[PDB]
Design a binder for this molecule. Structure first.
Ligand SMILES: [Mg+2]
Ligand SMILES: [Zn+2]
Ligand SMILES: [Zn+2]
Lengths: 112, 65, 391, 147, 262, 56, 136, 30, 15, 43, 49, 182
């Protein structure tokens, strides 16, 4: 009866932003970006990339409870390098890698 | 009753397999372990569908509406 | 609701679906387990009362109990089973995962600790990142037989400035035990902090545990063949001793202990030998079980089970008994129709040789059902009577 | 509940992508806590899981009859013949990170029974309901909306 | 450079391929996608005109929900909440209907093939109930005896698995890596020896033996992933790979946009 | 015994309990339905007035 | 920043008791007859055979709390390059046994080390976090 | 041959021939 | 190990 | 249903305890747990 | 599959739980363990068939 | 079963012999003449009824071919001997000492007894198809599970409870794991 509607797993809420960027006080140059309507599938993907970057000190994420689909992602970088910029870089990386994979795969598929 | 469609784990469609299954058992006398294989149920998540299934819709049909 | 602990304040978090959700540390004081159990909630309607609850009957205030003057709440179940595995020496955690673990500690400062191993590779030990959960300025030392400042067996426990030095966290440390970690944090840092502790320790251990994985299976209950034959004979000789006692007393050559009737002294001895046998068998099964046996892992952590369990799964079920005696004679001069009259052999009077893993012969099974019934009956009586004392 | 006297509620539900999964692609429909087994000392709940797993593969239902010659080793051998680990342990990967679990999970079919008790029939919450005519204290019972 | 893919087995129902030169996460991210977030067509609603059957009505509408449909072109069918009409139309939905009247004295069988598409499809390939049987019948919805009649209308809409599993395009997905234990992500439970007891995995053949005489390499990372994918048939398997990849790609893109607009 | 020393009362809710790891020790999850049923009579004052107004 | 202690030892005994990844090492000094070492190393990383000689060093800082550890970037000169196996820890106990024989105890994340010898030698070790360095 | 002793599995055939005759709830009916 | 129901085939092929 | 049909009752030597004579006559396993434990019996 | 074995009264299915009692006509002896002057009682409950 | 010493050959043996058995299954699989059945078995003095009173004076063997004849893998359970030469009667099958509820339990020998009791009680309240005709009948609170499944692990006795025709549950892939702590 009280089961929340299934579509709330993905459909964005009413006037509810996709991201939220909150600077964290405890450590300098570090910031936490809450995502809405996301889960591991997207979350773990980025964090791996964020760790490939030499210039990124700390990256981690957590889904604070399995009911709600959202998570927090925390980045920390060396000074003078905007964490948001870092996240942009990680995304541009992934999108590249995927597009490459698609090309390579369809290529391999035609040979069958 | 009546042939669960798809499958409670893997999601492979198990519905249509049912008729051909009974066909094989009645016609060819093949044992289940062979039948399910020839039907192409590789995993045992599927296999338990067909094998364990109990079909009561037959015993329901025999009542007059 | 027989404890003052059994009614406690709480701080509402509205969540969907149906059941009340609550952390598992609090499952013990309620004497609660989650299968079909229900819990009445009561909202105070007056600001005054609302205050009283927060300031008196709150859960963080209830951690220490006046009954046994120790913690009544402590790490339990999967969390406790995991935390042991986490604090082992063999455990190490790579960078990527150490980060996430740290970030699960809500109040963590933002300071990555220096990895316990550098070059080759960074590696954090388990104790190291667990210490993140523990608040600073805590000092604990506990020494056991075999414990030494090196502690080769990793017995005991030591913590300095909220850093685990050695010792493996388990029941006698993080559990409800008298001198436990919890018991100390409560006094040192105040209860309001001690509560926050549980949340930290759990969210970490639980996290690393879902990525480590844990389980159990029949392979855990199976003992290697040489052990099996060793158990077998170890019983057989016991039966042999019993048989000799039988022959002796049949020949009237036995002298009963004073104050004890002849047949009393006979039964007394026979049972003595038997329980000695079952025990000696169990010990063998334990010694055999290697360090990666899951059940053994659960017992060593102390989460569930105990020695006697592995005794009965891997080794022997032992003597079944009704009313503190061996199985009596329902039929004239025999326990079951399958035995000739006046047969006192422990097979006849209800010793159960086979372990649950091997299964029981029928006349064994029946006996074991009799014992079980005694266990259900008296339990119903004790419960019904004890409450009427409590009143 | 099982046929073995195991009874439990549902803790939570996950979807396919979030459950652990075997290399062969099977995902478990249900997961239970290891700590159930040792305390309760129900081995049959294990044995059945194994025996079933064989019956599943071979396509021949198993005989669980109480007193027979069927032995655990006998089953283990049969299972090994189908190429799975002979004790029923199986390598699983975590759902979230897609990484092998340092421990292997005892995994297989088992037969379960749903029970009458259902949360919807139980939950109720009262504030200012009707009062019994006699004592003018809240009525008894959920259907009567008592406190 | 980027990943490379080698297809070992390509059938109608299955693709098996080795994916390589990719961090673990990207892989797992993929299979999670294909299991969940790929769009698909499915029956989202039922209107039962007349049901004399023994099967409970919603029991039927359940089975109809599970019946795979042809999703090839689903890309261009909009979501329900996206289209501005009231309830449905030919833009956001496809209408199917079924008439079953038991004729013979012997038991009559309602098949998936008996659905018929009444709604204009604008010449796009969608909604045909898929028959992978050799005999050409398909899913068995319900049985009828003589006077028992079933007549109903189904409204098929677009959706994804996370909403309800009846949209899941992919059957079980075999994921594996490091068939030998070289990376040591797993320690083996055993009785006497682990090597003898633990079965040799088939994919082991495509990698080198462990070479027992060696010290442990701690630098290596997981790649060379073994993926077998199985489509329900509502999408051809190659499309399952491609589309899943694309969907994930659009998702990350959405992240990038959210950053862009701030 | 029945009607004085203890009694059946209002403002109470009963349901199954199940465990959650992600909750702090002292909390409890209370399902939305029950929440929407039970109620606490707070008093209007300058501080809460805006928040209450929104609730109404 | 500078070495607190150095020596070459030789392994007397290796114990893989109960543990797969950590062995306990009984090693004696090449030089001072009164200097002993008991230590627990990860073997899977840094394998060890008995009778092997081991260069051992402490060096309280690798420079040439309150400081967040960082992934070494690249081209960074950390010292530690010479030494094959590096650990980090703290002395949790100073035990005065006899005469000039002093023993210190360094916990490294739960891997234990007992260092012992002439009071002349070891005076540089007080309560601070120590790095442990080994090669060969 | 017909006069040979019987194996254990055989015994089930007897039990079948029992319930065919009696039925599960027969004592009530008789 | 399992329960034998193929006794219809066995008793038909023997009698 | 079936277990309910065969179910046998004893109106209120310790009767509740399972007795040796019950061998083969009365189920050792099936009993209700509660005040009526061991007083109810199954064939 | 219906097993019968019950009665229908007022459109509800009633069953008779087998009622139990001690045999009639059998001699029984029992000790009296208490101060009561009777050391042994011999009961017989007699009833026609 | 009625055991008889009287024999052409040596020791004691059950009166029932294979010939009778095949003569029964002829009846069963058939549906030739006179329908050899339980009544027949009882009239010919092969099988006998025994109460608790007469149970005093007799001696019973658990398995016919184990304990009748006069004379080992480690897995099998340990058994007693045949030394008693006087067996008057032999048990049909020991499993029959279980009631209906317990019969559904697989391998009840391997369970601690109270878990058999708790199962005996809980098994009564499970959902499952109670009667084929529910559709045509009216009563308060009927419960029917959509897709019943007959268990993979079965007890032979289930054949006579119709439990394969009216199953109460569903086989489900189950892993014993400590996973998310939930
Ligand atoms: Mg409970
Ligand atoms: Zn399947
Ligand atoms: Zn529209």
């Amino acid at each position: 009866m009280n089961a929340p509607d299934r579509f709330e797993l993905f459909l964005l809420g009413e006037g509810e932003s996709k991201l939220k960027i909150d600077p964290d006080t405890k450590a300098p140059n570090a910031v936490v970006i809450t995502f809405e309507k996301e889960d591991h599938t997207l979350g773990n993907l980025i964090r791996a990339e964020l760790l490939n970057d030499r210039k990124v000190l700390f990256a981690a994420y957590k889904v604070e409870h399995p009911f709600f689909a959202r998570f927090k992602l925390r980045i920390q970088t060396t000074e003078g390098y905007d964490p948001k910029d870092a996240l942009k870089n990680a995304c541009n990386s992934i999108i590249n890698k995927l597009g490459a994979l698609k090309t390579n795969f369809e290529t391999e598929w035609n040979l069958q | 009753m009546i042939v669960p469609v798809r499958c409670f784990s893997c999601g492979k469609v198990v519905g249509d397999k049912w008729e051909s299954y009974l066909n094989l058992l009645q016609e060819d006398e093949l044992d289940e372990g062979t039948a399910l294989s020839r039907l192409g149920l590789k995993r045992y998540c599927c296999r338990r569908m067909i094998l364990t299934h109990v079909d009561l819709i037959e015993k329901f049909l025999r009542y007059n509406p | 609701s027989l404890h003052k602990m059994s009614m406690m304040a709480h701080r509402v978090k509205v969540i969907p679906y149906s059941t009340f959700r609550l952390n598992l540390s609090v499952t013990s004081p309620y004497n609660a387990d989650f299968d079909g159990d229900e819990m009445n909630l009561h909202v105070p309607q007056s600001e005054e009362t609302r205050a009283e609850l927060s300031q008196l009957c709150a859960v963080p205030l209830q951690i220490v109990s006046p009954q046994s003057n120790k913690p009544c709440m402590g790490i339990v179940q999967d969390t406790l089973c995991g935390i042991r595995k986490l604090t082992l020496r063999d455990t190490f955690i790579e960078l990527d995962q150490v980060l996430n673990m740290l970030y699960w500690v809500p109040d963590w400062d933002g300071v990555i600790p220096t990895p316990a191993i550098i070059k080759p590779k960074p590696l954090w030990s388990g104790k190291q990142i667990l210490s993140v959960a523990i608040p600073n300025g805590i000092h604990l030392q506990r020494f056991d037989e075999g414990t030494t400042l090196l502690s080769p067996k990793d017995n005991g426990m030591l913590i300095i400035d909220g850093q685990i030095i050695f010792g493996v966290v388990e029941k006698k440390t993080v559990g409800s035990s008298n001198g436990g970690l919890i018991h100390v944090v409560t006094r040192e840092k105040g209860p309001q902090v001690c509560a926050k502790l549980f949340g930290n320790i759990q969210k970490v251990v639980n996290f690393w545990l879902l990525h480590n994985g844990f389980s159990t299976g029949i392979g855990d209950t199976i003992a290697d063949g040489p052990t099996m034959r060793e158990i077998t004979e170890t019983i057989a000789e016991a039966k042999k001793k019993v048989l000799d006692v039988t022959k002796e007393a049949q020949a009237n050559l036995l002298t009963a202990k004073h104050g004890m009737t002849l047949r009393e002294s006979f039964e007394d001895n026979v049972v003595r030998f038997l329980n000695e046998a079952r025990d000696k068998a169990g010990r063998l099964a334990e010694v055999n079980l290697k360090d990666l046996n899951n059940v053994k892992q659960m017992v060593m952590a102390g989460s569930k089970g105990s020695f006697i369990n592995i005794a009965q799964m891997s080794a022997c079920v032992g003597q079944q008994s009704v009313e503190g005696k061996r199985i009596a004679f329902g039929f004239v001069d025999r326990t079951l129709p399958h035995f000739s009259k006046d047969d006192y052999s422990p097979e006849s009077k209800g010793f159960v040789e086979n372990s649950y893993l091997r299964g029981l012969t029928p006349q064994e099974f029946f006996f074991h059902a009799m014992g079980g019934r005694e266990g259900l009956i008296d339990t119903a009586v004790k419960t019904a009577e004890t409450g009427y004392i409590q009143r | 509940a099982s046929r073995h006297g195991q009874k439990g509620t549902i803790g939570i539900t996950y979807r396919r992508e979030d459950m652990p999964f075997t290399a062969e692609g099977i995902v478990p429909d249900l997961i239970i806590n290891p700590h159930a087994i040792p305390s309760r000392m129900t081995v049959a709940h294990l044995i059945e899981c194994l025996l079933s797993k064989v019956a599943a593969l071979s396509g021949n239902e198993g005989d669980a009859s109480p007193f027979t010659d069927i032995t655990v080793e006998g089953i283990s051998k049969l299972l090994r013949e189908h190429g799975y680990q002979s004790r029923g342990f199986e390598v699983m990967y975590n759902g979230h990170t897609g990484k092998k679990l340092m421990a292997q999970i005892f995994f297989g079919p088992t037969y379960y029974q749903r029970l009458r008790h259902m949360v919807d029939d139980k939950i109720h919450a009262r504030a200012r309901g009707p009062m019994q005519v006699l004592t003018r204290q809240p009525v008894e019972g959920r259907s009567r909306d008592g406190g | 450079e980027g990943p490379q893919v080698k297809i070992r087995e390509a059938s109608k129902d299955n693709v098996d391929f080795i994916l390589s030169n990719v961090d673990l996460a990207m892989a797992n991210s993929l299979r999670r996608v294909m299991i969940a977030e790929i769009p698909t067509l499915a029956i989202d609603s039922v209107e039962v005109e007349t049901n004399t059957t023994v099967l409970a009505d919603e029991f039927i509408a359940h089975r109809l929900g599970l019946i795979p449909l042809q999703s090839m072109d689903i890309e261009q069918l909009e979501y329900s909440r996206d289209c501005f009409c009231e309830d449905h139309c030919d833009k956001c939905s496809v209408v199917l209907t079924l008439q079953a009247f038991g004729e013979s004295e012997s038991t009559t069988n309602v098949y998936s093939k008996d659905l018929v598409i009444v709604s204009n499809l604008m010449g796009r390939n969608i909604g045909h109930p898929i028959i992978q049987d050799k005999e050409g019948n398909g899913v068995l919805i319900c049985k009828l005896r003589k006077g028992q009649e079933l007549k109903l209308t189904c409204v098929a809409k677009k959706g994804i698995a996370k909403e309800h599993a009846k949209w899941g395009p992919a059957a079980a997905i075999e994921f594996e890596y490091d068939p030998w234990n070289k990376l040591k992500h797993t320690d083996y439970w055993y009785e006497q020896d682990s090597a003898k007891e633990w079965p040799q995995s088939k994919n082991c053949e495509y990698e080198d033996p462990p070479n027992e005489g060696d010290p442990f390499d701690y630098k290596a990372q997981a790649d060379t992933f073994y993926m077998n994918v199985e489509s329900v048939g509502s999408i051809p398997v190659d499309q399952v790979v491609v589309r899943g990849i694309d969907t994930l790609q659009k998702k990350v893109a959405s992240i990038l946009l959210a950053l862009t607009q701030m | 015994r029945g009607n004085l020393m203890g009694k059946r009362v209002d403002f109470s809710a009963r349901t199954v309990i199940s465990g959650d790891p992600n909750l702090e020790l002292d909390q409890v999850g209370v399902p939305k339905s029950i929440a929407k049923t039970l109620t606490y009579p707070e008093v209007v004052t300058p501080y809460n007035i805006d928040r209450l107004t929104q609730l109404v | 920043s500078n070495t607190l202690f150095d020596d070459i030892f030789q392994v007397s005994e290796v114990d893989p008791g109960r543990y797969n990844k950590v062995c306990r090492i009984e090693a004696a000094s090449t030089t001072q007859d009164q200097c002993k070492l008991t230590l627990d190393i990860n073997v899977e990383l840094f394998p060890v055979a008995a009778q092997d000689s081991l260069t051992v060093t402490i060096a309280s800082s690798l420079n040439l709390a309150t400081r967040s550890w960082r992934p070494p970037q690249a081209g960074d000169r950390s010292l530690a390059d010479d030494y094959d196996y590096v650990m980090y820890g703290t002395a949790y106990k100073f035990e005065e046994v006899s005469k000039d024989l002093i023993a210190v105890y360094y916990s490294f994340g739960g891997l234990l080390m007992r260092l012992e010898g002439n009071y002349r030698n070891l005076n540089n070790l007080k309560q601070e976090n120590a790095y442990l360095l080994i090669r060969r | 041959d017909e006069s040979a002793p019987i194996t254990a599995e055989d015994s089930w055939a007897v039990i079948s021939a029992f319930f065919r005759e009696k039925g599960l709830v027969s004592q009530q009916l008789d | 190990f399992i329960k034998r129901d193929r006794m219809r085939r066995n008793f038909l092929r023997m009698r | 249903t079936l277990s309910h049909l065969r179910r046998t009752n004893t109106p209120i030597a310790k009767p509740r305890q399972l007795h040796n004579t019950h061998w083969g006559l009365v189920c050792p396993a099936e009993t209700p747990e509660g005040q009526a434990c061991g007083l109810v019996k199954n064939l | 599959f219906d097993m019968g074995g019950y009665f229908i009264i007022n459109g509800s299915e009633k069953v008779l739980i087998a009622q139990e009692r001690s045999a009639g006509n059998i001699v029984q002896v029992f000790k009296k363990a208490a101060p009561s002057p009777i050391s042994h009682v011999a009961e017989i409950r007699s009833a026609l068939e | 079963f009625i055991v008889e010493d009287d024999e052409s050959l040596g020791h004691k043996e059950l009166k029932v012999r294979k010939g009778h058995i095949a003569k029964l299954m002829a009846t069963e699989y058939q549906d030739d003449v006179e329908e050899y059945t339980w009544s027949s078995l009882l009239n010919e003095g092969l099988v006998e009824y025994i109460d608790a009173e007469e149970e005093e004076s007799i001696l019973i063997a658990m398995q016919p071919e184990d304990l009748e004849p006069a004379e080992v893998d480690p897995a099998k359970r340990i058994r007693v001997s045949h030394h008693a030469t006087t067996f008057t009667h032999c048990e049909i099958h020991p499993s029959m000492i279980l009631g209906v509820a317990a019969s559904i339990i697989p391998f009840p020998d391997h369970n601690q007894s109270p878990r058999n009791t708790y199962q005996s009680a809980m098994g009564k309240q499970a959902m499952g198809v109670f009667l084929t005709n529910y559709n045509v009948r009216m009563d308060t609170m009927a419960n029917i599970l959509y897709y019943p499944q007959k268990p993979l692990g079965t007890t032979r006795a289930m054949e006579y409870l119709k439990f394969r025709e009216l199953p109460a549950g569903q086989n489900a892939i189950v892993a014993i794991a400590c996973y998310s702590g939930y």
